[PDB]
């Protein structure tokens, strides 16, 4: 009932579900005057203010339907193509054959047709002589036209629609002057046209229900469009009451007289008491329930342009799940048919429609959510459109069809787009990873946590709080870094803060008590504190090769003073993430040389004395193409990994020079001028210094990006790899949009082993943020689902994985809540789920 839907604001589709795809007639057919066709209201509206040629290329459209394999195909009948004047006399000879041969082949192909009698292409004679929907004599003319199609087409058509979105016919045809006939600002004609459009449907329904439904046994309804709206405040009720009045004004306008009680909503009658026409109580009984089902439209026609709806100062939304929830509550749980759904793409997107995959992915995800979870009686879904066509006042500037059609080509070949392949698999499956592993980790596995820059034995206050945090965990290791600018403030070995080195020694010595073998990081840059000593940053920072020489002097200082207890060393922590901070390759050039000098200083002098291991931690985010149907994304998927992992790997692991794929691609951009930068070419000596300067592999893996292709402009680093990233609102994301994708680490641990031989691998940073501070359910799901994947690679792919370090042991007051402990160092529930996996050593 009306007014009840306001409470909405507070994985396989069912069998025998109707998968289909629909078009119009003015957008797709073309040939507006061939074979003695009458002029439509738009034909005069276009020529005063070809196309897809589907009227002649029907066999090419039949092949397109067999590709997707749809159960139904929604098309409208051009009223002036049968009767040029609208008066039912005798249909056109050639025009009748088109819809006859169309309905014949669809039944031959087991494609049940769904026909709409009016799709905004009204004959110009009824608009010129009578006046269109302003004069009410057309009500019995549309009923006459409906009778003709009920006779000669009713035997093959068992699903009929009267008007396709009558809200736009009145509001945009007589209010905004956007659609045909195009009259801006006519309050009278708007609600009068909306009146006749409701009365014309009821006459056609009672016609079919009493004169053709007995011997044809079909259905008839009306496609009503709407939008969705969210309040500017969840707690506010007036902001929610304003949303209820918004949906009523656009959806309840045509649904209450048809699906509700036979009259306009109470809010509409009260708002426009003297403008909205009156439904006699005799009319109310002859209109309530004139719909066998509830055809529904949810496309860009009720969202774009901005003047389409009245937002009442609230936020617009595209959530289809709650849109059907409002329909199921306001109209006594009907059986809905989404007769139109999908967004659009610009004309520049030929057949590489990447967003259309993820736009369709949300809707079907929300439709399935409505069916299986919200108990919405949806029995069908209509994709829109089947092929690109004339999109009304937008002309050919946008593309909404699932088949690309070159409008400048004479053959008009329908080439399937990226959404056609995705939608076909959606239909074939009627609705990427692996199950659980069930196995134990090795007893020599390094369970670790991780801190960050710890600015400065039990007398130290900050150590006591951190020492009480490493007691609840059963971690075997502890990863943290040192403030380079706090031991050598001058950046030279003359000034040695002996108090700061004594503080760090008391950290590890107190850790040696607790049994947590430490892993110290000499350098840890970020956006907050860059870390470089002030004289070094004053002297060009990392852009001067003397800073790398200053790192070796600082490295050996920590090696001698801390190598007694520390047996695991990390030089730089995520140096690949310095690009965000040609003028970056040279900076990373010194970051690579500084690592070697810090590693050669340990391998020769301090390795036999202390007997440890030294390496560096790299940003190890896995990548995958954003469109598995566009090849340019597959090649760019590895191009991201080469520009990220191999940038600091092939030198320090394998060859000694930069990755050739990264080195050769940058030159191709500079070849035609795109980049004014060049990757430095190394000599025999520098490559001989960097080669094999690691004792293991360390990775900073958090999530998985979806790279796609684009000719990025600029001479910066991001413009050198020609890559753009796509966020998927379907997949479970984090508060900071970290897409929780577990199967990315397995494909990464497999990529490292294949590329850089069989070495020991360590996961030095793996975590997730969550707004929760006491029951971080996202982290436990993130931790368990990710720890499930590293076990899969160990026991199946035989990857030498030996350590796992959770990202943050604690967080800051205004920092992203990435830690396992609160700002006040209170234990979240994530610690105890970690101990369950550490004590169990995996999942038995």
């Amino acid at each position, epitope marked *: 009932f009306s007014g009840d839907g306001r409470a909405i604001w507070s994985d396989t589709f069912p069998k025998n579900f109707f998968w289909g795809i629909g078009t119009g007639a003015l957008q797709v057919e073309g040939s507006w005057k061939k074979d003695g066709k009458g002029p439509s209201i738009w034909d005069h509206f276009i020529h005063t203010h070809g196309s897809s040629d589907s009227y002649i290329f029907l066999e090419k459209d039949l092949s397109a339907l067999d590709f997707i394999g749809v159960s139904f195909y929604q098309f409208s009948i051009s009223w002036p193509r049968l009767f040029p004047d609208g008066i039912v006399t005798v249909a056109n000879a050639k025009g009748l054959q088109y819809y006859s041969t169309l309905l014949d082949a669809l039944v031959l192909r087991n494609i049940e047709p769904i026909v709409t009698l009016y799709h905004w292409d009204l004959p110009l004679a009824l608009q010129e002589k009578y006046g269109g929907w302003k004069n009410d004599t057309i009500i019995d003319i549309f009923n006459d036209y409906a009778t003709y199609c009920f006779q000669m087409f009713g035997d093959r058509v068992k699903y009929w629609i009267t008007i396709h979105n009558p809200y736009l016919v009145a509001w945009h045809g007589y209010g905004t002057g956007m659609h045909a006939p195009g009259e801006k600002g006519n309050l009278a004609a708007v609600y009068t046209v909306g009146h006749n459009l409701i009365k014309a449907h009821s006459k056609v329904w009672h016609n079919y229900n009493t004169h053709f439904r007995p011997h044809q046994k079909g259905w008839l309804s009306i496609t009503l469009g709407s939008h969705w709206i969210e309040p500017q405040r969840s707690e506010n009720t007036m902001d929610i009451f304003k949303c209820q009045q918004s949906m009523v004004s656009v959806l309840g306008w045509f649904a209450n007289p048809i699906h509700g009680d036979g009259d306009y909503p109470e809010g509409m009658r009260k708002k426009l008491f003297s403008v909205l026409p009156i439904f006699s109580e005799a009319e109310k009984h002859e209109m309530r329930g004139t719909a066998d089902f509830f055809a529904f439209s949810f496309g860009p026609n009720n969202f774009k342009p901005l003047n389409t709806m009245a937002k009442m100062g609230q936020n617009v939304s595209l959530n289809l799940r709650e849109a059907l929830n409002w329909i199921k509550l306001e109209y006594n749980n009907p059986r809905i048919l989404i007769a139109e759904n999908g967004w659009f793409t610009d004309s520049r997107v030929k057949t590489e429609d990447t967003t259309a995959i993820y736009m369709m992915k949300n809707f079907l995800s929300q439709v399935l959510q409505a069916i299986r979870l919200d108990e919405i009686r949806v029995f069908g879904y209509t994709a829109w459109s089947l092929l690109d066509g004339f999109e009304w006042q937008d002309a050919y500037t946008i593309r909404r069809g699932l088949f690309y059609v070159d409008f400048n080509s004479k053959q008009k070949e329908r080439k399937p787009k990226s959404s056609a392949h995705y939608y076909k698999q959606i239909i074939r499956e009627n609705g990427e990873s692996t199950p659980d592993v069930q196995g134990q980790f090795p007893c020599d596995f390094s369970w670790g946590v991780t801190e960050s820059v710890l600015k400065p034995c039990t007398d130290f206050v900050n150590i006591k709080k951190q020492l009480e945090m490493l007691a609840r965990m059963k971690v075997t290791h502890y990863r943290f870094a040192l403030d380079w600018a706090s031991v050598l403030p001058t950046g030279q070995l003359s000034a040695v803060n002996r108090q700061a080195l004594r503080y760090y020694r008391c950290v590890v010595s107190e850790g040696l008590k607790l049994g947590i073998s430490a892993m110290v990081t000499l350098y840890y840059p970020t956006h907050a504190h860059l870390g470089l000593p002030e004289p070094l940053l004053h002297a060009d920072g990392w852009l001067n090769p003397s800073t790398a020489e200053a790192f070796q002097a600082y490295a050996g200082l920590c090696f001698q003073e801390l190598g007694d207890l520390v047996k695991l060393w990390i030089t730089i922590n995520e140096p690949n993430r310095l690009s965000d901070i040609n003028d970056t390759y040279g900076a990373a050039h010194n970051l690579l040389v500084a690592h070697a000098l810090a590693w050669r200083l340990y391998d020769r002098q301090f390795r036999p004395s202390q007997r440890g291991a030294v390496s560096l931690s790299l940003h190890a985010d896995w990548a995958e193409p954003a469109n598995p*149907y*566009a*090849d*340019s994304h*597959w*090649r*760019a*998927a*590895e*191009r991201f*990994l*080469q520009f990220e992992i*191999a940038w600091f790997a*092939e030198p320090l692991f394998k*060859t000694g020079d930069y*990755p*050739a*794929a990264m080195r*050769e*691609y940058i*030159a*191709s*951009k500079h070849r035609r001028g795109l980049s004014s930068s060049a990757l430095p070419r190394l000599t025999e000596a520098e490559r001989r210094l960097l080669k094999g300067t690691v004792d293991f592999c360390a990775l900073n893996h958090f999530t998985t990006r979806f790279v796609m*292709h684009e*000719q990025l402009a600029g001479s910066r680093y991001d413009s050198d790899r*020609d890559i753009q990233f796509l966020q998927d609102i379907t997949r479970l994301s984090s508060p900071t949009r970290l897409a929780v994708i577990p199967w990315g680490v397995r494909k990464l641990l497999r990529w490292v082993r294949r*590329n850089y031989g069989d070495m020991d691998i360590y996961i030095t940073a793996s975590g997730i943020d969550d707004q929760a501070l006491e029951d971080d359910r996202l982290r436990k799901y993130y931790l368990g689902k990710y720890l499930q994947e590293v076990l899969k690679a160990y026991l199946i792919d035989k990857v030498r994985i030996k350590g796992y370090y959770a990202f943050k042991l604690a967080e800051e007051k205004s920092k992203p809540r990435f830690g396992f402990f609160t700002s006040d160092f209170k234990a979240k529930s994530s610690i105890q789920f970690y101990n369950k996996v550490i004590s169990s050593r995996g999942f038995p």
Partner: nanobody
Amino acid sequence: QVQLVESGGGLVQAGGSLRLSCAASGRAIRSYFMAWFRREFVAAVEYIFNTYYAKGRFTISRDNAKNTVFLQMNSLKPEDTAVYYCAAGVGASSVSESWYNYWGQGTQVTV
């Protein structure tokens, strides 16, 4: 750091078929797009789908799982009797025998 082992052999009468195959070897080849040349441009595959010809008789595929590009030459005319070699560009985008960095040995074809 990639190598191309352009295998195959060609010595058949007119109208015959041939199954050429170039074995990919080196590092990070999935970021490379490969092509076949006769110099003259024959075919090319951007990963798996994007195929460019210069048509209707040759088929360029790329079984990336086995790291091997194929070149099915159906209805071979005697004018197609020359050496066939494979290449590998640099990810983005144009033939011109210059956008391809790595080249193979080559297989002989006679008709």
